[PDB]
């Protein structure tokens, strides 16, 4: 492997890198999108995924909303094979100060863990939805307990925070 994790907790591996490079080298079947409820794909995760699929994620999203329930926080919807052997799991997390941030976050991870194959995911709700990294991380660890999972972050700071959480 060209790209190796900076931490591994049980079956959960943690990576730092640009999204396109992690997809290319880690070869996921399922990519989790940090979605917003109206599926406008903006931000460091959602725009990068859209672009990687040549705009197909957005095409499928517009199609989806013609006949399908908007995605409420706490839920996720899988678009299968947005590209051949790359499904996008559109996970909509809670925002800081919503009710039941932890229950909704944890439910998102429960949905993510039911997907098939190799999964590559960011930490849901961390960044612009302003949930503390450790709250999202704790829900992930608590919920996805016996399942191979790959988690990515972009910044040095985020990596350190994750390392500090485990190092104590």
Swiss-Prot record:
It is found in: Host membrane. Residues 1-168 form the Macro domain. It is a multi-pass membrane protein. It catalyses: Thiol-dependent hydrolysis of ester, thioester, amide, peptide and isopeptide bonds formed by the C-terminal Gly of ubiquitin (a 76-residue protein attached to proteins as an intracellular targeting signal). This is Non-structural protein 3. It comes from Feline coronavirus (strain FIPV WSU-79/1146) (FCoV). The chain holds residues 1331 to 1498 of 6709 of the full protein.
């Amino acid at each position: 492997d060209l790209i190796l994790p900076f931490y591994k907790a049980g079956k959960v591996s943690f990576y730092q890198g640009d999204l396109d490079v992690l997809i290319n080298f880690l070869e996921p079947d399922v990519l989790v999108n940090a979605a917003n409820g109206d599926l406008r794909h903006v931000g460091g995760v959602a725009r990068a995924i859209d672009v990687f699929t040549g705009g197909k994620l957005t095409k499928r999203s517009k199609e989806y909303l013609k006949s399908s329930k908007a995605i409420a926080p706490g839920n996720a919807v899988l678009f299968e094979n947005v590209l051949e052997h790359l499904s996008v799991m559109n996970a909509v997390g809670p925002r800081n100060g919503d009710s039941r941030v932890e229950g909704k976050l944890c439910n998102v991870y429960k949905a993510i863990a039911k997907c098939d194959g190799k999964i590559l995911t960011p930490l849901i709700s961390v960044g612009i939805f302003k949930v503390k990294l450790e709250v999202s991380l704790q829900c992930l660890l608590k919920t996805v307990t016996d399942r191979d999972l790959n988690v990515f972050v972009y910044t040095d700071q985020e990596r350190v925070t994750i390392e500090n959480f485990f190092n104590g």
